[PDB]
């Protein structure tokens, strides 16, 4: 629709601000770090092998990319309300839903462009700097682009969910760590402990499906197929469903903001 | 040799200087390779699979009857290498004294508990930087061919989890669980079952003898 | 001085915001989970060996606490300017540095009271429900851990103030805060280690142990692991410098010195902020 206007608005906000030079360069410094300085434990050297630098890169991506998302869309709604600008925008012929969708699309294009520029700079660095080990990177790094971008989008939607309920931007961050904390620490630790409590009786047929209930686990499954009960296509569809339900809940909460 | 549907695949008892190279044990029961006081030997090439337990009828042998791929006992000097022990109820049961034995290049896949080392001495099953495939081994091959950075310190509990619930490896590759493990391999929790392979293996050897 | 008034309003913000509940609830969940739900990585579900919890919990804290402090403090200066209440406050007879220190003490007391509350639920949680721990070692270990964690919170607060004084808008402040967070934990360790391994085979062996002082995240880890804790075997990174940067008060002085230089930097930047 016409959400494109809001989308370009936060695109201009991202370019005018220092995110793009601090989110794309964020990946640029680490990705070259993980690819050449990431085997420093026993022998500093480079591009050991594509699936090696991908595993550590994905492991740090789980820790940091969700956190970037939660730090990009907590002030997205509540921040405008504090600024008093949200209401003037709500006067326009847009409505509750289109504002949220437009901001989501804009921030998602911010994250997608950042991923493309930074990991693409890392990939061209891999190609040029290192020997012609392999170039058909495309499947591995391209799947990394898509998976990291979708993970960023799903945690962006969670940030919209939490923001649309908090009334003071400062309190929004407090409920932003909570969502980040639950998926990073609480889910894995609690799931493992529950498995340990149920010695042999957890019914292991339904453990892979419980792994679906965490976007981080889905993202780590996606970048672990270099050569499982859950099809790869379903492994994508589930993350897409996470995004859809998160955006539906964010729209539902936003409608009753005032 | 080929032993199928037995109650002890290979009973290597009280002997010396033999070669058991190239043998093959199929769905046996209660034991795969029972070695008592077997010294100066060149155990190689064996393949042991699905050594079922003593489960017939309505019974349970509590804390007993568990199948064993390799029951290595009192055998101080061997050259065990390039063996595939799979789908067993236990592997490399090591009692009495078996120091100076050279173990390397083996493959332990899908075991309920991969080792039951009991001696109070320290023994490294890695001659000349070559360990064992160790399906339970959790992560870490950062150098391309550095065989492994973490030494495979066996824990019986994690072995049970990694067999029944095979997805738990994913759950234990999270950076949070990773740093927890980094702190549990530094400040020992669970007293060290002594066995420790300084150089475990990430590639799976014994691929030639999988199916022949 | 009038500093206490600004700290009082910041504490009042802490209660009127879910922050004080959120920081303490999640931080206590951290602490309790590592003791009972933790150690399940090895399959031994529940035990409260004091050396383990204060080390794994220490690493999870050296990641969590800097981020929490940065989230609290990044918008202390830029947020007021965007809100439109900063220009009003300067009209009052308050020095720019005076309000800066007031905000610093307010946020620092927020996080200190928060960690005290959160572990206070934890400290009882172990003591009452565990079987036979020597309470004295537990007490002094968690005491060093509480004070180290709150000091790291303060140093990252000061970093947030300096970056906020540098920045012009809230979102860019958050971006720089995230950059400063990522840099210390993931990059100051990795680049420094890589430095020894290849830049330094024999290039300059003697310098690497001391440089770990620059990063407060490393100082914090060394303080909480080395300790008086028994079985003190340090793995990679820390073991270089675990043996001897000659301390037992030197690391504490260095951490306080980082907080000091950062507060002076914040006073300097915030003085020249306008126009």
XYZ file of C-alpha atoms in Angstrom:
745
model
C 0.000 0.000 0.000
C 1.192 3.496 0.923
C 3.183 2.299 3.962
C 6.104 2.954 1.617
C 6.156 6.588 2.755
C 6.811 5.595 6.366
C 9.277 2.979 5.136
C 11.376 5.589 3.341
C 10.997 7.845 6.377
C 12.844 5.422 8.650
C 15.177 4.528 5.772
C 16.214 8.190 5.745
C 16.350 8.067 9.542
C 18.750 5.129 9.381
C 20.979 6.763 6.791
C 21.002 10.161 8.531
C 21.679 8.452 11.862
C 24.769 6.342 12.504
C 23.147 2.886 12.529
C 24.076 1.939 8.973
C 27.730 2.775 9.595
C 27.470 1.081 13.016
C 25.361 -1.965 12.088
C 26.945 -2.852 8.734
C 30.437 -2.055 10.017
C 29.451 -3.994 13.133
C 29.124 -7.149 11.041
C 32.107 -6.180 8.885
C 34.555 -6.060 11.796
C 33.316 -9.271 13.431
C 32.878 -11.298 10.237
C 36.460 -10.669 9.145
C 37.349 -11.272 12.784
C 35.602 -14.640 12.867
C 36.973 -15.602 9.437
C 40.653 -14.732 9.969
C 41.018 -14.052 13.708
C 38.465 -16.669 14.798
C 40.845 -19.637 14.911
C 43.309 -17.640 17.019
C 42.883 -20.146 19.871
C 45.346 -22.558 18.278
C 47.049 -20.893 15.287
C 45.994 -17.481 13.978
C 45.357 -17.787 10.233
C 42.484 -17.448 7.818
C 39.512 -18.967 6.039
C 40.133 -22.382 7.516
C 36.962 -23.511 5.702
C 33.576 -21.993 4.875
C 31.423 -24.101 7.241
C 33.873 -23.357 10.071
C 33.547 -19.534 9.974
C 29.829 -19.959 9.449
C 29.263 -21.905 12.674
C 30.934 -19.361 14.963
C 29.418 -16.510 12.955
C 25.927 -17.942 13.491
C 26.636 -18.569 17.172
C 27.570 -14.922 17.742
C 24.703 -13.863 15.466
C 22.200 -15.483 17.818
C 23.686 -13.533 20.722
C 23.868 -10.158 18.989
C 21.366 -9.796 16.104
C 18.263 -10.304 18.319
C 19.793 -7.729 20.651
C 20.231 -5.306 17.751
C 16.578 -5.818 16.833
C 15.380 -5.162 20.390
C 17.526 -2.001 20.413
C 16.062 -0.747 17.127
C 12.310 -0.999 17.799
C 11.669 -0.346 21.479
C 11.418 3.433 21.014
C 9.685 2.853 17.664
C 6.159 3.318 19.035
C 6.431 4.577 22.628
C 9.148 6.986 21.510
C 6.860 8.845 19.128
C 4.185 8.962 21.835
C 6.667 10.577 24.227
C 7.656 12.982 21.464
C 3.977 13.743 20.926
C 4.404 13.203 17.191
C 2.607 9.852 17.020
C -0.828 11.421 17.516
C -0.356 13.924 14.680
C 0.585 11.016 12.425
C -2.521 9.152 13.623
C -4.572 12.129 12.437
C -3.545 11.368 8.824
C -5.493 8.919 6.600
C -3.297 5.956 7.534
C -4.811 4.169 10.526
C -3.331 2.109 13.322
C -2.217 -0.862 11.233
C -0.455 0.918 8.387
C 1.789 2.912 10.741
C 3.092 -0.237 12.424
C 3.473 -2.103 9.132
C 5.352 0.805 7.567
C 7.743 1.149 10.489
C 8.304 -2.615 10.462
C 9.067 -2.630 6.732
C 11.427 0.323 7.078
C 13.344 -1.160 9.996
C 13.445 -4.546 8.281
C 14.929 -2.992 5.159
C 17.448 -1.291 7.457
C 18.507 -4.649 8.900
C 18.444 -6.369 5.498
C 20.577 -3.685 3.852
C 22.985 -3.796 6.788
C 23.316 -7.580 6.516
C 23.828 -7.385 2.758
C 26.473 -4.657 2.872
C 28.417 -6.075 5.796
C 28.414 -9.807 5.169
C 28.846 -9.064 1.455
C 31.960 -7.044 2.234
C 33.110 -9.998 4.326
C 32.367 -12.422 1.472
C 34.270 -10.378 -1.104
C 37.100 -10.188 1.434
C 37.016 -13.995 1.676
C 37.114 -14.281 -2.115
C 39.872 -11.741 -2.786
C 42.148 -12.123 0.243
C 42.087 -15.916 0.465
C 42.774 -18.639 -2.102
C 40.139 -19.894 -4.511
C 39.034 -22.636 -2.131
C 35.402 -22.459 -3.248
C 32.941 -19.964 -4.700
C 29.670 -21.906 -5.006
C 30.018 -19.374 -0.321
C 26.833 -18.500 -2.187
C 24.690 -21.227 -0.619
C 26.292 -20.833 2.810
C 26.570 -17.045 3.010
C 23.336 -16.424 1.096
C 21.417 -18.693 3.446
C 23.137 -16.804 6.257
C 21.811 -13.538 4.798
C 18.252 -14.831 4.578
C 18.276 -16.534 7.985
C 19.865 -13.614 9.843
C 17.490 -11.157 8.162
C 14.420 -13.202 9.111
C 15.684 -13.551 12.690
C 16.182 -9.795 12.836
C 12.655 -9.298 11.529
C 11.098 -11.655 14.075
C 12.837 -9.983 16.999
C 11.946 -6.605 15.475
C 8.306 -7.699 15.570
C 8.730 -8.771 19.196
C 10.133 -5.313 19.946
C 7.042 -3.766 18.356
C 4.901 -6.093 20.484
C 6.501 -4.955 23.738
C 6.722 -1.270 22.780
C 3.021 -0.893 21.981
C 2.163 -1.604 25.620
C 4.798 0.346 27.557
C 4.049 4.021 28.211
C 7.584 5.326 28.909
C 10.510 4.623 26.554
C 12.754 3.921 29.542
C 10.476 1.095 30.696
C 10.366 -0.268 27.134
C 14.030 -1.282 27.295
C 13.390 -3.175 30.529
C 10.842 -5.378 28.772
C 13.229 -5.534 25.797
C 15.971 -7.375 27.675
C 13.326 -9.756 29.028
C 12.374 -10.942 25.559
C 16.065 -11.160 24.649
C 16.860 -12.866 27.960
C 14.128 -15.496 27.644
C 15.190 -16.776 24.222
C 18.957 -16.604 24.798
C 19.276 -17.911 28.372
C 15.950 -19.042 29.806
C 14.712 -21.256 26.978
C 17.807 -23.420 26.507
C 18.620 -23.725 30.212
C 15.047 -24.473 31.290
C 14.524 -26.946 28.441
C 17.744 -28.783 29.296
C 16.848 -28.918 32.990
C 13.357 -30.210 32.183
C 14.924 -32.944 30.064
C 17.237 -33.805 32.969
C 14.297 -33.901 35.402
C 12.443 -36.339 33.124
C 14.969 -39.148 32.879
C 13.882 -41.028 29.769
C 10.205 -40.056 30.049
C 10.242 -36.673 28.280
C 8.894 -38.426 25.141
C 11.756 -37.450 22.786
C 9.430 -37.504 19.761
C 8.234 -34.013 20.767
C 11.590 -32.403 21.566
C 12.378 -31.162 18.018
C 8.981 -29.454 17.937
C 9.689 -27.774 21.277
C 12.862 -26.463 19.646
C 10.606 -24.714 17.107
C 9.169 -22.607 19.936
C 12.442 -20.567 20.047
C 13.467 -18.416 17.048
C 17.125 -18.719 18.070
C 16.951 -22.521 17.870
C 15.293 -22.264 14.448
C 18.029 -19.933 13.233
C 20.773 -22.248 14.507
C 19.154 -25.268 12.838
C 19.039 -23.368 9.543
C 22.804 -22.792 9.425
C 23.682 -26.350 10.451
C 23.021 -28.373 7.287
C 26.402 -28.445 5.525
C 27.157 -31.970 4.314
C 16.691 -33.996 10.821
C 13.018 -34.710 11.559
C 11.926 -31.129 10.856
C 11.988 -30.315 7.034
C 14.087 -27.352 5.967
C 11.013 -25.830 4.321
C 9.060 -26.238 7.558
C 12.138 -24.928 9.382
C 11.654 -21.707 7.363
C 7.836 -21.650 7.502
C 7.932 -21.812 11.308
C 10.107 -18.694 11.569
C 7.813 -17.002 9.052
C 4.841 -17.957 11.239
C 6.664 -16.483 14.238
C 7.003 -13.219 12.316
C 3.356 -13.297 11.273
C 1.935 -13.938 14.732
C 4.295 -11.390 16.293
C 3.159 -8.710 13.845
C -0.481 -9.693 14.380
C -0.056 -9.299 18.143
C 1.770 -5.987 17.685
C -1.066 -4.656 15.524
C -3.613 -5.916 18.060
C -1.872 -4.192 20.975
C -1.261 -1.003 18.983
C -4.961 -0.521 18.197
C -5.658 0.031 21.913
C -2.571 2.151 22.616
C -4.499 5.179 23.886
C 35.205 -63.402 11.112
C 31.452 -62.777 11.259
C 29.465 -63.439 14.449
C 25.707 -62.834 14.394
C 22.956 -63.276 16.981
C 25.194 -64.656 19.727
C 25.628 -64.139 23.470
C 29.304 -63.171 23.226
C 30.734 -62.192 19.854
C 34.431 -62.644 20.625
C 35.669 -64.059 23.940
C 39.397 -63.271 23.810
C 40.476 -64.865 27.072
C 43.772 -65.099 28.899
C 46.148 -65.072 25.925
C 49.077 -63.289 24.294
C 50.421 -61.837 21.036
C 47.368 -62.379 18.841
C 46.011 -60.394 15.908
C 42.260 -59.824 15.686
C 42.505 -57.578 12.633
C 39.591 -57.168 10.259
C 36.917 -59.057 12.186
C 33.247 -58.096 12.287
C 30.561 -58.611 14.945
C 26.877 -58.134 14.109
C 23.767 -58.012 16.329
C 25.256 -59.951 19.250
C 24.115 -59.945 22.872
C 25.593 -59.154 26.309
C 29.102 -58.590 24.888
C 30.843 -57.567 21.707
C 34.572 -58.119 22.301
C 35.392 -59.615 25.708
C 39.139 -59.401 26.355
C 40.683 -60.817 29.522
C 44.424 -60.487 30.164
C 45.081 -60.072 26.429
C 48.595 -58.699 26.076
C 50.937 -57.686 23.258
C 48.120 -57.720 20.700
C 47.171 -55.761 17.581
C 43.392 -55.427 17.920
C 42.311 -53.604 14.752
C 39.560 -53.462 12.176
C 36.743 -54.859 14.298
C 33.143 -53.715 13.916
C 30.616 -54.248 16.719
C 26.963 -53.274 16.345
C 23.785 -53.552 18.420
C 24.950 -55.737 21.330
C 21.510 -56.149 22.898
C 21.078 -56.785 26.643
C 19.602 -59.700 28.574
C 15.959 -58.746 27.998
C 13.682 -61.711 27.298
C 10.269 -61.860 28.932
C 8.845 -59.663 31.653
C 12.044 -58.816 33.519
C 14.581 -56.068 34.121
C 18.163 -56.759 35.219
C 18.528 -53.660 37.395
C 22.102 -52.322 37.201
C 23.260 -55.320 35.187
C 23.016 -57.144 31.898
C 24.005 -54.023 29.943
C 25.557 -54.898 26.588
C 29.177 -53.952 25.951
C 30.963 -53.332 22.659
C 34.489 -53.744 24.055
C 35.017 -55.298 27.477
C 38.735 -54.655 27.883
C 40.047 -56.180 31.097
C 43.550 -56.538 32.593
C 45.079 -56.205 29.093
C 48.071 -53.960 29.718
C 49.614 -53.971 26.228
C 47.538 -53.845 23.047
C 47.511 -51.800 19.837
C 43.769 -51.172 19.591
C 43.134 -48.832 16.668
C 40.763 -48.415 13.723
C 37.704 -50.103 15.258
C 34.029 -49.167 14.888
C 31.823 -49.727 17.949
C 28.220 -48.689 17.344
C 24.677 -48.862 18.731
C 25.856 -50.573 21.907
C 24.650 -50.237 25.474
C 28.225 -49.377 26.529
C 31.705 -49.277 25.045
C 35.334 -49.683 26.074
C 34.502 -50.928 29.559
C 37.908 -50.606 31.211
C 38.584 -52.244 34.573
C 41.585 -53.809 36.309
C 44.759 -52.222 34.990
C 45.279 -51.516 31.292
C 47.984 -48.834 31.348
C 50.475 -48.615 28.441
C 47.701 -49.687 26.035
C 47.631 -47.662 22.797
C 44.095 -46.686 21.736
C 43.525 -44.394 18.755
C 41.438 -43.877 15.649
C 38.395 -45.753 16.925
C 34.753 -44.871 16.283
C 32.035 -44.827 18.954
C 28.639 -43.852 17.537
C 25.201 -44.042 19.128
C 26.255 -45.530 22.464
C 24.122 -45.164 25.579
C 27.361 -44.649 27.523
C 30.593 -44.624 25.567
C 33.057 -45.496 28.352
C 33.079 -46.865 31.921
C 36.679 -46.215 32.973
C 37.140 -47.048 36.660
C 40.869 -46.952 37.461
C 42.325 -44.201 39.647
C 45.141 -43.482 37.244
C 45.235 -41.071 34.235
C 45.468 -42.631 30.774
C 45.277 -40.780 27.445
C 43.762 -42.705 24.530
C 45.493 -40.501 21.961
C 48.768 -41.768 20.512
C 50.567 -39.265 18.257
C 47.711 -36.779 18.166
C 44.949 -39.199 17.122
C 41.880 -39.787 19.290
C 38.481 -41.342 18.666
C 35.419 -40.167 16.779
C 33.398 -39.737 19.995
C 29.856 -38.974 18.787
C 29.131 -37.347 22.153
C 31.930 -34.794 21.638
C 30.275 -31.374 21.803
C 31.503 -28.910 19.238
C 34.865 -27.176 18.604
C 37.028 -27.830 15.496
C 38.063 -24.177 14.955
C 41.439 -24.847 13.179
C 40.526 -26.591 9.931
C 42.221 -29.862 10.765
C 43.133 -29.389 14.399
C 41.390 -32.594 15.440
C 39.832 -30.869 18.455
C 40.445 -28.240 21.093
C 38.395 -29.642 23.977
C 39.617 -32.930 25.406
C 36.789 -35.467 25.492
C 36.232 -35.834 29.218
C 33.434 -38.425 29.358
C 30.339 -37.684 31.405
C 27.885 -40.563 31.769
C 24.840 -38.301 32.132
C 25.426 -36.222 28.989
C 25.961 -39.449 27.032
C 22.461 -40.595 27.978
C 20.965 -37.269 26.877
C 22.866 -37.162 23.573
C 21.534 -40.620 22.649
C 17.874 -40.541 23.687
C 17.403 -36.879 22.711
C 19.686 -36.411 19.676
C 18.737 -32.749 19.196
C 20.286 -31.751 22.538
C 23.591 -31.111 20.773
C 21.919 -28.119 19.137
C 20.609 -27.048 22.534
C 24.149 -27.307 23.909
C 25.742 -25.279 21.114
C 24.022 -22.068 22.233
C 26.598 -19.449 23.321
C 25.124 -19.335 26.834
C 25.308 -23.097 27.335
C 28.687 -22.891 25.602
C 30.078 -20.483 28.204
C 28.517 -22.570 30.979
C 30.407 -25.587 29.636
C 33.526 -23.420 29.314
C 33.182 -22.839 33.065
C 32.446 -26.524 33.769
C 35.631 -27.674 32.008
C 37.671 -25.166 34.046
C 36.244 -25.612 37.558
C 35.657 -29.388 37.569
C 32.079 -30.472 38.214
C 31.568 -34.258 38.312
C 34.836 -35.891 39.362
C 36.986 -36.783 36.350
C 36.297 -40.271 35.057
C 40.002 -40.406 34.193
C 39.863 -41.112 30.482
C 40.613 -38.022 28.448
C 41.482 -37.808 24.761
C 43.644 -34.735 24.246
C 43.078 -34.929 20.467
C 39.554 -36.175 19.669
C 38.365 -36.593 16.095
C 35.697 -34.626 14.218
C 35.856 -36.574 10.966
C 34.411 -40.060 11.178
C 37.099 -42.688 10.504
C 36.457 -46.385 9.780
C 34.302 -45.396 6.808
C 35.830 -48.196 4.724
C 34.491 -50.921 7.029
C 30.992 -49.537 7.688
C 29.266 -51.871 5.214
C 31.329 -54.383 3.261
C 25.285 18.565 47.113
C 22.184 19.244 44.941
C 23.535 16.042 43.430
C 21.392 14.070 45.874
C 18.238 15.746 44.537
C 18.928 14.536 40.991
C 19.857 11.094 42.282
C 16.566 11.090 44.200
C 14.555 11.875 41.081
C 16.424 9.124 39.224
C 15.595 6.607 41.962
C 11.972 7.771 41.802
C 12.075 7.116 38.058
C 13.423 3.675 38.914
C 10.338 2.791 40.937
C 7.863 4.449 38.564
C 9.512 2.477 35.737
C 9.383 -1.298 35.548
C 13.189 -0.989 35.354
C 13.864 -1.677 39.031
C 11.521 -4.660 38.962
C 12.802 -5.769 35.550
C 16.522 -5.495 36.316
C 16.170 -7.217 39.686
C 13.727 -9.909 38.569
C 15.741 -10.927 35.506
C 19.074 -10.637 37.313
C 17.769 -12.855 40.128
C 16.459 -15.316 37.524
C 20.003 -15.344 36.148
C 21.449 -16.003 39.605
C 18.983 -18.734 40.623
C 19.034 -20.451 37.238
C 22.804 -20.885 37.282
C 22.652 -22.560 40.688
C 19.768 -25.022 40.257
C 18.889 -25.027 36.557
C 22.561 -24.417 35.827
C 25.235 -27.120 35.746
C 22.764 -29.149 33.660
C 25.167 -28.780 30.735
C 27.004 -31.747 32.269
C 23.815 -33.569 33.283
C 24.278 -33.064 37.030
C 21.107 -31.059 37.514
C 21.232 -29.379 40.889
C 24.178 -28.419 43.058
C 25.497 -25.138 44.419
C 29.267 -25.494 44.506
C 30.245 -21.875 45.271
C 33.321 -21.835 43.011
C 31.265 -22.862 39.936
C 28.225 -20.534 40.302
C 30.414 -17.477 40.988
C 32.351 -18.242 37.778
C 29.655 -19.194 35.268
C 27.363 -16.558 36.763
C 30.377 -14.238 36.554
C 30.677 -14.684 32.779
C 26.944 -14.371 32.183
C 27.125 -11.197 34.276
C 30.094 -9.757 32.381
C 27.840 -10.013 29.329
C 24.517 -8.951 30.824
C 25.508 -6.118 33.170
C 27.344 -3.855 30.662
C 24.352 -4.076 28.332
C 21.895 -3.267 31.128
C 23.975 -0.291 32.260
C 24.233 1.010 28.698
C 20.474 0.651 28.179
C 19.811 2.525 31.412
C 22.217 5.367 30.772
C 22.546 6.002 27.008
C 19.602 8.435 27.012
C 20.453 10.260 30.243
C 21.855 13.265 28.352
C 20.533 12.946 24.795
C 17.128 11.850 26.075
C 16.705 15.017 28.122
C 17.688 17.203 25.159
C 15.165 15.481 22.884
C 12.527 15.617 25.612
C 12.967 19.370 25.944
C 13.611 19.311 29.698
C 17.398 19.660 29.457
C 17.342 23.360 28.556
C 15.073 24.021 31.544
C 17.344 22.167 33.976
C 20.474 24.130 33.040
C 18.634 27.341 33.950
C 18.618 26.136 37.570
C 21.760 26.806 39.658
C 23.226 23.414 38.761
C 26.607 22.861 37.165
C 26.645 20.793 33.991
C 29.098 18.441 35.669
C 26.977 18.570 38.809
C 23.896 17.264 36.982
C 26.090 14.724 35.191
C 27.349 13.327 38.500
C 23.801 13.442 39.856
C 22.557 11.298 36.985
C 25.551 8.984 37.398
C 24.928 8.446 41.116
C 21.226 7.968 40.465
C 21.662 5.252 37.853
C 24.487 3.679 39.849
C 22.327 3.460 42.957
C 19.542 2.036 40.789
C 21.730 -0.816 39.573
C 23.422 -1.331 42.956
C 20.132 -1.569 44.850
C 18.855 -3.758 42.014
C 21.717 -6.267 42.177
C 21.503 -6.261 45.978
C 17.767 -7.025 45.831
C 18.140 -9.663 43.123
C 20.946 -11.590 44.786
C 19.251 -11.058 48.143
C 16.562 -13.370 46.850
C 19.399 -15.552 45.537
C 21.601 -15.463 48.649
C 18.747 -16.729 50.812
C 17.755 -19.123 48.013
C 21.042 -21.019 48.311
C 21.641 -20.716 52.056
C 18.226 -21.944 53.193
C 17.673 -24.631 50.551
C 21.166 -26.055 49.926
C 22.658 -28.950 51.927
C 25.753 -28.063 53.947
C 27.628 -25.111 52.432
C 30.249 -23.241 54.439
C 28.324 -19.963 54.686
C 31.467 -17.864 55.157
C 33.022 -18.654 51.779
C 29.657 -18.177 50.076
C 29.273 -14.788 51.759
C 32.682 -13.386 50.876
C 32.565 -14.784 47.328
C 29.153 -13.287 46.545
C 30.314 -10.120 48.298
C 33.226 -9.743 45.902
C 30.841 -10.659 43.083
C 28.236 -8.060 44.077
C 30.798 -5.277 44.403
C 32.554 -6.255 41.164
C 29.251 -6.418 39.273
C 28.083 -3.031 40.545
C 31.487 -1.505 39.759
C 31.295 -2.847 36.200
C 27.784 -1.436 36.009
C 29.142 1.954 37.046
C 31.982 1.908 34.507
C 29.603 1.053 31.670
C 27.242 3.747 32.954
C 30.099 6.228 32.585
C 30.773 4.934 29.069
C 27.098 5.496 28.277
C 27.318 9.077 29.551
C 30.386 9.855 27.434
C 28.793 8.423 24.287
C 25.510 10.219 25.029
C 27.324 13.521 25.423
C 29.032 12.891 22.095
C 25.831 11.955 20.235
C 22.942 14.088 18.911
C 19.941 11.720 18.740
C 18.588 8.856 20.843
C 18.819 6.192 18.134
C 22.415 7.071 17.262
C 23.191 6.979 20.984
C 21.783 3.450 21.148
C 23.860 2.484 18.121
C 27.086 3.773 19.658
C 26.185 2.096 22.961
C 25.680 -1.231 21.194
C 29.003 -0.722 19.430
C 30.802 -0.060 22.712
C 29.128 -3.125 24.243
C 30.065 -5.459 21.387
C 33.604 -4.065 21.186
C 34.764 -4.878 24.724
C 33.281 -8.361 25.139
C 33.706 -9.883 21.683
C 36.517 -7.849 20.087
C 38.919 -6.686 22.807
C 39.363 -10.349 23.758
C 39.535 -11.802 20.249
C 41.858 -9.209 18.700
C 44.152 -9.292 21.730
C 44.417 -13.087 21.662
C 44.919 -13.132 17.947
C 47.566 -10.578 18.679
C 49.626 -13.012 20.705
C 49.057 -15.991 18.527
C 50.312 -14.573 15.293
C 51.607 -11.101 15.709
C 53.504 -12.404 18.570
C 55.328 -15.687 18.218
C 58.449 -14.049 19.635
C 57.691 -10.442 18.626
C 57.129 -9.147 22.183
C 56.139 -11.847 24.713
C 56.335 -9.649 27.809
C 53.532 -7.067 26.982
C 50.274 -9.142 26.513
C 49.452 -10.027 30.181
C 49.255 -6.426 31.310
C 47.124 -4.975 28.412
C 44.086 -6.998 29.699
C 43.616 -4.113 32.158
C 42.376 -1.819 29.373
C 39.150 -3.890 29.057
C 36.973 -3.760 32.200
C 35.184 -6.891 31.047
C 38.490 -8.844 31.300
C 39.434 -7.208 34.673
C 36.023 -8.205 35.997
C 36.438 -11.799 34.832
C 39.912 -12.105 36.357
C 38.745 -10.599 39.659
C 35.810 -12.977 39.942
C 37.576 -16.155 38.779
C 41.030 -15.868 40.381
C 39.829 -14.763 43.826
C 40.682 -16.908 46.816
C 38.769 -19.629 44.962
C 40.349 -23.065 45.137
C 41.178 -25.221 42.131
C 42.040 -21.965 40.381
C 42.999 -23.278 36.945
C 42.388 -20.645 34.267
C 41.690 -21.600 30.654
C 42.625 -19.495 27.606
C 42.834 -15.632 27.706
C 42.693 -15.361 31.489
C 45.588 -17.784 32.180
C 47.868 -15.208 30.610
C 47.600 -12.681 33.479
C 45.847 -15.124 35.811
C 49.316 -16.002 37.042
C 50.647 -12.476 37.634
C 49.642 -8.857 36.817
C 50.833 -8.472 40.554
C 47.431 -7.496 42.134
C 44.830 -8.215 44.904
C 44.132 -4.491 44.904
C 45.673 -3.466 41.584
C 42.730 -4.669 39.503
C 40.287 -2.889 41.817
C 42.290 0.331 41.534
C 42.412 -0.033 37.740
C 38.648 -0.550 37.488
C 38.015 2.487 39.691
C 40.521 4.402 37.551
C 38.558 3.507 34.419
C 35.386 4.803 36.059
C 37.251 7.964 37.046
C 38.731 8.750 33.642
C 35.362 7.999 32.049
C 33.541 10.384 34.396
C 36.102 13.095 33.627
C 35.610 12.394 29.915
C 31.846 12.732 30.351
C 32.262 16.022 32.210
C 34.530 17.277 29.424
C 32.241 16.255 26.551
C 29.032 17.414 28.239
C 30.566 20.822 28.980
C 31.138 21.488 25.260
C 27.913 19.759 24.139
C 25.684 22.709 23.238
C 26.294 24.106 19.742
